[PDB]
Amino acid sequence: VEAVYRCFKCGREVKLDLSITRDLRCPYCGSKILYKPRPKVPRRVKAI
Amino acid sequence: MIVPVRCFTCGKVIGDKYYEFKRRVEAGEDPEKVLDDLGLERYCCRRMLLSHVELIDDIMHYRVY
Amino acid sequence: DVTPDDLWIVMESYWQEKGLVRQHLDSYNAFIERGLQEVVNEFGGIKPDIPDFEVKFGKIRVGEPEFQEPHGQRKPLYPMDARIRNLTYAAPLYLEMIPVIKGVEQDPVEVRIGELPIMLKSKVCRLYGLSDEELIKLGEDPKDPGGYFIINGSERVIVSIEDIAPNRTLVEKDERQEKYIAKVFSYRHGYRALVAVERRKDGILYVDIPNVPKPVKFVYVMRALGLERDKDIVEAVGNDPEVQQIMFDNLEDASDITTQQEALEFIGKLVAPGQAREYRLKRAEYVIDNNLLPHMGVSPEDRIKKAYYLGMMALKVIELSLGRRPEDDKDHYANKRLRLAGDLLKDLFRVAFSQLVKDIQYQMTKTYQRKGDKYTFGNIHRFIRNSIRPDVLTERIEHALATGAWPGGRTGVSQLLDRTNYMSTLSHLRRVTSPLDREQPHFEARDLHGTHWGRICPTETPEGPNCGLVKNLALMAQITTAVPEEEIREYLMSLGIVPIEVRRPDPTLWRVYLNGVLIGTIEDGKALVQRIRQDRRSGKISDVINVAYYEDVKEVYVNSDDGRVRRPLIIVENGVPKLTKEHVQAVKEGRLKWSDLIKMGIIEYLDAEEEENAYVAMWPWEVTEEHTHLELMPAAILGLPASLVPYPEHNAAPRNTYGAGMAKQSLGLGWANFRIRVDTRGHLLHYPQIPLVNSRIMKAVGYEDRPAGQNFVVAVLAYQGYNMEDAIIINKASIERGLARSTFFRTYEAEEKKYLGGQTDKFEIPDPTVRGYRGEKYYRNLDEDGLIFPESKVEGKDVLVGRTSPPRFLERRETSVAVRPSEKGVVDKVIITETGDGTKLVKVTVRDLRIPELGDKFASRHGQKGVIGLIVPQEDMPWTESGIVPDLIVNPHGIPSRMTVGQLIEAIGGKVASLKGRRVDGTAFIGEPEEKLRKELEELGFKHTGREIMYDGITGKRLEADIFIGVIYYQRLHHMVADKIHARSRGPVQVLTKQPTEGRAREGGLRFGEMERDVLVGHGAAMLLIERLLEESDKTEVWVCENCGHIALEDKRRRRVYCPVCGEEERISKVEMSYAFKLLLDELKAMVIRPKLNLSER
RNA sequence: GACCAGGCG
DNA sequence: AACTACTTCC
DNA sequence: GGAAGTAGTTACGCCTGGTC
Ligand SMILES: [Zn+2]
Ligand SMILES: [Zn+2]
Ligand SMILES: [Zn+2]
């Protein structure tokens, strides 16, 4: 399953599947750490 | 972090006055005179501007993405 | 003269040049530069069971921090990635091997013997010498001082240990047998030996050796150490006629029984009981060379020097017997040396390297025997490389750092670094601990000593068992790092000291001791001391050297060791301090640095020994010709959390201790790195503020850049009895506007564990067909990948990482990670990464907004702890004629019993600072006087007493009395009532005892201990005791055979109850008893005890 | 589950 | 460790 | 009677985390 992922050192998006890919790395700067991005959905917050 | 919008004690809005106070004080003017000119007479309001730390600049550098 | 405000500049320069963690960095840098090679030099080359082969050890080298990928190669590794991917921030360690084939040496081979963890900000770390922007780009706080390790992703700080000074003999009285005891802790290669001599009530001299089961007469040991002649022994021990007579009497009965050659055999009888005379001799000489005075040496050539040292110790114990000298104080800091990260790492590395050496010897012998000599000598490089097995050393070192259990009995050496705020982290990095057991009442060791002045904080110490035994360093304290002893010995010998071999000690001759061991003898020891300190001030002698003399007993002590806590002082000569105004101006303008002032001989470092010879003044106007030193800054004798307190000398000492301890628990922006940091728990005050009344030390250190707390408008009055008994009344409008608001962070971790046989677990949303499936509602926020989307509201028991594991029931089991049952929040951050072994790892961070409520703990810097007793609307709060509404109200009844005048002075100062627009200096002894503050408050248009006319909010009329009101810096502690409330109706139970589990995290039950049992009994409540202790914990029913009394057996398959011991079926009846008592019956029926039960009809 | 460390009253 | 109390060799 | 040995205890909860 293709999932949207964000690298650690650089903020530009990386695409892969964790279940298949044995090795996780940003193929641009070689960073092993990734951020699961915030979904583009509305969030309701009470201002109190 | 970032300057409080309102005085914690009496609710007077002091969010805008902080940058003016900072630049005027750095310019060398008397802090008491600057605070009087800005309109902060109660010492509760003067506490908010006098003791505030701009910590937003020091934490903006780390992103969560 | 020089104002104290001018000495403040010099002290600020001291703190600017050298950070607050310089002890850890200095010790670790010394360890890396010379310590590792020193250890490897102790560990001679490995000699295996090979005919003509042995390997020598070359030079230890430590590389950059790198991590070996499971399927890739050694990438560079940075501390953030090391502490996020749960790695250990270590570096490759390389050792050259010199093979000696038949007495000749071949070319070296470099092999990696393991990884060595790297302390942050040290000279080998990747963060060393980096600008603020570079550290920021690496995702690091530039304010972080380093000095700690990262082991398996957790930050470990090594706390210094307050041990007794090695190789220094101390004399004291037993007071039981009228025996004078003089003991020394001799150290050599990480091994301590407790050699003690003893003068008993009979006047005979006894010596104790740790591995000799029984004490031995002193003259026997003296003759065993090579002293053949009796008169030589008597001369060596002492020349004073009374001491001469004592030694003659002690030696006549020894020579009449045991001669020189007989002493070794006599020791051998006790050391090695039996008939093997040669084995007895071998054991006796082994315990002589190794187990008696190891610091002198282990070769037979060092036996004679052992004899001289033992004679000196005997002379000291005799002098104590004659009363010519006082008892040696054990709490005196001349007698205690700290053990730092460098030396502790040295010992741990020594143990690990011994393990590795033995392992490599075994591997070499095995491989040589099990493939002969085909390629062992054909290609020796592969033979060495394949026999390395480097994981042993790194596993040992990493385990020791992670658990904190050092080799030997030492425990708790490495502790988890506190990251609650800036103050807590820095104070933990500046902490000192004692090895004594906290349970015992060490009255002499738990009290403040006069030698602690300027070395240990007098007020910062925990309450309870650790009081006095856990200490924090004063801000002026500096801990030495050892200089090479041989150069110091050579210089001292060149100064005119003649070794004891040529000239024997005499009453009219000064005994010189270097590093606690006697080196020689000189006349006019005062001249030698003066020459030493003049040379040190001239710069030709290193800073670390310290020297003192004692006119009472004519002894000159020279110290050059490591772990001495020192303080800086201004040298005063002929009534004029060396520091002048032009020096202060040069320091202020940046032309001169602290190291420069130390090198010119303007400022001196003194430990307790040298300070004993000093006559220190405290103020520049107090200097007279008789003074030797001047205090740089008396306010620097406090610790860092203790320096947070303003006006600390107007408070009672217990309240200062409370405030210093509570300063480390406040909420604030501890580190700007918090957003991307993965930590188990953390807090963040939304609007930190600078204390209006603050010490200058707090700005110099850097606390202003990371403040923790806010300035409140505090009125001291009693209001509706809701602030009674140290309770606090707070304003609802102030809370709703952001006062004391905070956010709580928790980071949950889930690893995709790889079991044996390829049976892995999977990150996925489990189907309801899996075993242990939770409700389908608990997976509401999960994504198809198996991870919860960020910024999604998560409440208690909702899962964050859906996970299923291979079945092990006797379908896939579920092992998903959910939030703790009592914790809610919003998912702030979800990261995915790879472990050290290569498995997927995910960290999820949940943030919970904590608005203050009833029960949350608030504290001031003056030790006034309290919880919110009420939250009052603004329209109900009283107000002042100037329009000032309190943000907080404190009962006046807490003021006089605690005697915290400093809090009232701080309120006055805060009001004055707010009115002036300039912050008030509240330094310990040079801060603004209270009289000046009162006069200024009077001139600003307010009452000088600080009392103001207030009106009651409820009724509208002014209060009869004038209310004291001001601005006090209150801090919110992390003891929130949401993190402590617990309630358990019924839940899980322990398997062994069937009683409720323990802990808030696992639905535990509260322990109704035996004290509460006695309380219930004293009330006469018998049925309530039954209900609380039997029905509600472990009530069960058992079958008892009335004929035998054993426990009958019930066959659920055959539907029968019977006693296997006797085969009865009719005399069987139920009894009701706690499951713990049935378990007790089981453990009593074990170890062969028969608890026969007799039953009664009720 | 037991060991250590740190706190709280 | 630092207390007591036995025990038990002397 | 010593004079050593030996054994037996040394407040009550509670919370947190970290490693086995
Ligand atoms: Zn990248
Ligand atoms: Zn206000
Ligand atoms: Zn029976």
CSV table of N, CA, C and O (backbone and C1' of nucleotides) in Angstrom, one decimal, chain C residues 152 201 214 399 402-403 416 680-681 746 820 999-1000 1006-1007 1009, chain F residues 2-5 9-20:
chain,number,residue,atom,x,y,z
C,152,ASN,N,21.0,3.2,24.3
C,152,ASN,CA,19.8,2.6,23.8
C,152,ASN,C,18.6,3.7,23.7
C,152,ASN,O,17.5,3.4,24.1
C,201,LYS,N,44.6,-2.3,73.7
C,201,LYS,CA,44.7,-1.9,75.1
C,201,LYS,C,45.9,-2.5,75.8
C,201,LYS,O,46.4,-1.9,76.8
C,214,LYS,N,42.8,-13.3,59.9
C,214,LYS,CA,43.0,-12.8,61.3
C,214,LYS,C,44.1,-11.8,61.3
C,214,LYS,O,45.0,-11.8,60.5
C,399,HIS,N,25.6,-2.3,28.9
C,399,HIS,CA,24.8,-2.8,30.0
C,399,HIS,C,25.1,-2.1,31.3
C,399,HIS,O,24.1,-1.7,32.0
C,402,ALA,N,23.6,1.4,31.0
C,402,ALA,CA,22.1,1.5,31.0
C,402,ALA,C,21.5,1.1,32.3
C,402,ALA,O,20.5,1.7,32.7
C,403,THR,N,22.1,0.1,33.0
C,403,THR,CA,21.5,-0.3,34.3
C,403,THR,C,22.0,0.5,35.5
C,403,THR,O,21.3,0.6,36.5
C,416,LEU,N,19.1,8.1,35.1
C,416,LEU,CA,18.4,8.7,34.0
C,416,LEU,C,18.4,10.2,34.2
C,416,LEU,O,18.0,10.7,35.2
C,680,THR,N,9.6,10.0,27.4
C,680,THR,CA,8.5,9.4,28.0
C,680,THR,C,7.5,10.3,28.6
C,680,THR,O,6.3,10.1,28.4
C,681,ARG,N,7.9,11.4,29.2
C,681,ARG,CA,7.0,12.4,29.8
C,681,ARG,C,7.7,13.8,29.7
C,681,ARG,O,8.9,13.9,29.8
C,746,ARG,N,3.4,12.7,26.3
C,746,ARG,CA,3.7,11.3,26.5
C,746,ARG,C,4.0,10.7,25.2
C,746,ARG,O,3.3,10.9,24.2
C,820,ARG,N,-2.6,5.0,27.9
C,820,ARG,CA,-2.8,4.5,29.2
C,820,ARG,C,-4.3,4.8,29.6
C,820,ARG,O,-4.8,5.8,29.2
C,999,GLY,N,-0.2,-0.8,41.4
C,999,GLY,CA,0.2,0.3,40.5
C,999,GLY,C,-1.0,1.0,39.9
C,999,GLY,O,-2.0,0.4,39.5
C,1000,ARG,N,-0.9,2.3,39.7
C,1000,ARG,CA,-1.9,3.1,39.0
C,1000,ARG,C,-1.9,2.7,37.5
C,1000,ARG,O,-3.0,2.8,36.9
C,1006,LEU,N,-5.2,-0.4,46.4
C,1006,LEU,CA,-4.4,0.3,47.4
C,1006,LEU,C,-4.1,-0.7,48.6
C,1006,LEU,O,-5.0,-1.5,49.0
C,1007,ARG,N,-2.9,-0.6,49.0
C,1007,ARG,CA,-2.4,-1.6,50.1
C,1007,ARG,C,-3.0,-1.2,51.4
C,1007,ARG,O,-2.7,-0.1,51.9
C,1009,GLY,N,-2.3,-1.9,54.7
C,1009,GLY,CA,-1.2,-2.5,55.4
C,1009,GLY,C,-1.6,-2.9,56.8
C,1009,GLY,O,-2.7,-2.7,57.3
F,2,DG,P,32.1,-9.4,81.7
F,2,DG,O5',33.0,-10.0,80.5
F,2,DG,C5',34.0,-9.2,79.9
F,2,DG,C4',35.4,-9.8,80.3
F,2,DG,C3',36.3,-10.1,79.1
F,2,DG,O3',37.7,-10.0,79.5
F,2,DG,C1',35.6,-12.1,80.1
F,3,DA,P,38.8,-9.5,78.5
F,3,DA,O5',38.3,-10.0,77.1
F,3,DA,C5',38.8,-11.3,76.6
F,3,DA,C4',38.4,-11.6,75.2
F,3,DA,C3',38.1,-10.4,74.4
F,3,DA,O3',38.5,-10.6,73.0
F,3,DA,C1',36.1,-11.7,74.5
F,4,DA,P,39.0,-9.4,72.1
F,4,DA,O5',38.1,-9.5,70.8
F,4,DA,C5',36.8,-10.2,70.8
F,4,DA,C4',36.9,-11.6,70.4
F,4,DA,C3',36.4,-11.9,69.0
F,4,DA,O3',36.9,-13.1,68.5
F,4,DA,C1',34.9,-12.7,70.6
F,5,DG,P,37.1,-13.4,66.9
F,5,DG,O5',35.8,-14.3,66.5
F,5,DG,C5',34.5,-13.8,66.3
F,5,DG,C4',33.5,-14.9,66.4
F,5,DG,C3',32.5,-14.8,65.3
F,5,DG,O3',32.0,-16.1,65.0
F,5,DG,C1',31.4,-14.4,67.3
F,9,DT,P,14.8,-10.7,61.6
F,9,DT,O5',14.5,-9.4,62.5
F,9,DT,C5',13.8,-8.3,62.0
F,9,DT,C4',14.2,-7.1,62.7
F,9,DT,C3',14.3,-5.8,61.9
F,9,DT,O3',13.0,-5.2,61.8
F,9,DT,C1',16.2,-5.9,63.3
F,10,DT,P,12.4,-4.5,60.5
F,10,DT,O5',13.1,-3.1,60.6
F,10,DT,C5',12.9,-2.3,61.8
F,10,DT,C4',13.9,-1.2,61.8
F,10,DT,C3',14.2,-0.5,60.5
F,10,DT,O3',13.2,0.5,60.3
F,10,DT,C1',16.3,-0.9,61.6
F,11,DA,P,12.5,0.7,58.9
F,11,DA,O5',11.1,1.4,59.3
F,11,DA,C5',10.3,1.0,60.4
F,11,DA,C4',8.9,1.6,60.3
F,11,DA,C3',8.3,1.5,58.9
F,11,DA,O3',7.7,0.3,58.7
F,11,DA,C1',8.0,3.7,59.8
F,12,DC,P,7.4,-0.3,57.3
F,12,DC,O5',6.1,0.5,56.8
F,12,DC,C5',4.9,0.5,57.6
F,12,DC,C4',4.0,1.5,57.1
F,12,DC,C3',3.7,1.5,55.6
F,12,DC,O3',2.7,0.5,55.3
F,12,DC,C1',4.0,3.7,56.4
F,13,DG,P,2.7,-0.3,53.9
F,13,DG,O5',3.4,0.8,52.9
F,13,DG,C5',2.9,0.9,51.6
F,13,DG,C4',1.8,2.0,51.6
F,13,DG,C3',1.7,2.7,50.3
F,13,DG,O3',0.6,2.2,49.5
F,13,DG,C1',2.1,4.3,52.0
F,14,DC,P,0.8,1.4,48.1
F,14,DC,O5',0.8,2.7,47.1
F,14,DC,C5',-0.2,3.7,47.2
F,14,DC,C4',0.3,5.0,46.7
F,14,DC,C3',1.0,4.9,45.4
F,14,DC,O3',0.1,4.9,44.4
F,14,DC,C1',2.2,6.4,46.9
F,15,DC,P,0.4,4.1,43.0
F,15,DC,O5',1.2,5.1,42.1
F,15,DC,C5',0.7,6.5,41.9
F,15,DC,C4',1.9,7.4,41.5
F,15,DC,C3',2.7,6.9,40.3
F,15,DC,O3',2.1,7.3,39.1
F,15,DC,C1',4.1,7.8,42.1
F,16,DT,P,2.3,6.5,37.8
F,16,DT,O5',3.8,6.9,37.3
F,16,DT,C5',4.1,8.2,37.0
F,16,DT,C4',5.6,8.4,36.8
F,16,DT,C3',6.2,7.4,35.8
F,16,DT,O3',6.1,7.9,34.5
F,16,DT,C1',7.6,7.8,37.7
F,17,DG,P,6.1,6.9,33.2
F,17,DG,O5',7.7,6.5,33.1
F,17,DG,C5',8.6,7.6,33.0
F,17,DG,C4',10.0,7.0,33.2
F,17,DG,C3',10.4,5.8,32.3
F,17,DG,O3',11.6,6.0,31.7
F,17,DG,C1',10.9,5.4,34.5
F,18,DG,P,11.8,5.6,30.1
F,18,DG,O5',13.1,4.6,30.2
F,18,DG,C5',14.2,4.9,31.1
F,18,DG,C4',14.8,3.6,31.6
F,18,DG,C3',14.6,2.4,30.7
F,18,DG,O3',15.7,2.0,30.0
F,18,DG,C1',14.3,1.9,33.1
F,19,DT,P,15.8,0.8,29.0
F,19,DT,O5',16.3,-0.4,29.9
F,19,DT,C5',17.4,-0.2,30.7
F,19,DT,C4',17.8,-1.5,31.5
F,19,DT,C3',17.7,-2.7,30.7
F,19,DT,O3',18.8,-3.6,30.9
F,19,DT,C1',16.3,-2.9,32.6
F,20,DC,P,19.4,-4.5,29.8
F,20,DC,O5',19.4,-6.0,30.5
F,20,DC,C5',18.4,-6.9,30.3
F,20,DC,C4',18.1,-7.7,31.6
F,20,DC,C3',17.2,-8.9,31.4
F,20,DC,O3',18.0,-10.0,31.2
F,20,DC,C1',16.4,-7.5,33.2
